Design a protein around this ligand. Structure first.
Ligand SMILES: COc1ccc(OC)c(-c2cc(C(C)=O)n3cccnc23)c1
Length: 113
């Protein structure tokens, strides 16, 4: 593993801790969510993100964070506010923004001096 891959694997593991049953860890099928593939044009999940890390397909934390945002937006757009899935997306969203805040990222860039 590389240093960038170590860092992104760590952020990913912290996000997955918020979803202990893995509802965000695999692609959502139309069989479990009617009409999903017509409503959500750009699917994303934590399994897909892990694969991208392993392929060194992320060049920056910004690129990783974009996928995290996408996964949350899809869940908040497809699902109604009363559902488990909408509430869990919001929980993951707040955690990710605290962990990868522009301030934390700046401090870490300084730790490399
Ligand atoms: C309750 O068991 C599971 C198992 C796997 C899931 O998606 C991978 C989901 C699931 C995950 C989602 C999401 C992420 O929107 N979802 C929406 C509607 C109905 N089911 C789901 C639920």
């Amino acid at each position: 593993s590389t240093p960038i891959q170590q860092l992104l694997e760590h952020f990913l593991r912290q996000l997955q801790r918020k979803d202990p049953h893995g509802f965000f860890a695999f692609p959502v099928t139309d069989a479990i969510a009617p009409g999903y593939s017509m409503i959500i044009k750009h699917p994303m999940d934590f399994g897909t993100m892990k694969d991208k890390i392993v392929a060194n397909e992320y060049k920056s934390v910004t690129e990783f964070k974009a996928d995290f945002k996408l996964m949350c937006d899809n869940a908040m757009t497809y699902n109604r506010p009363d559902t488990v899935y909408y509430k869990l997306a919001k929980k993951i969203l707040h955690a990710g923004f605290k962990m990868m805040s522009k301030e934390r990222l700046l401090a870490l860039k300084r730790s490399m001096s």
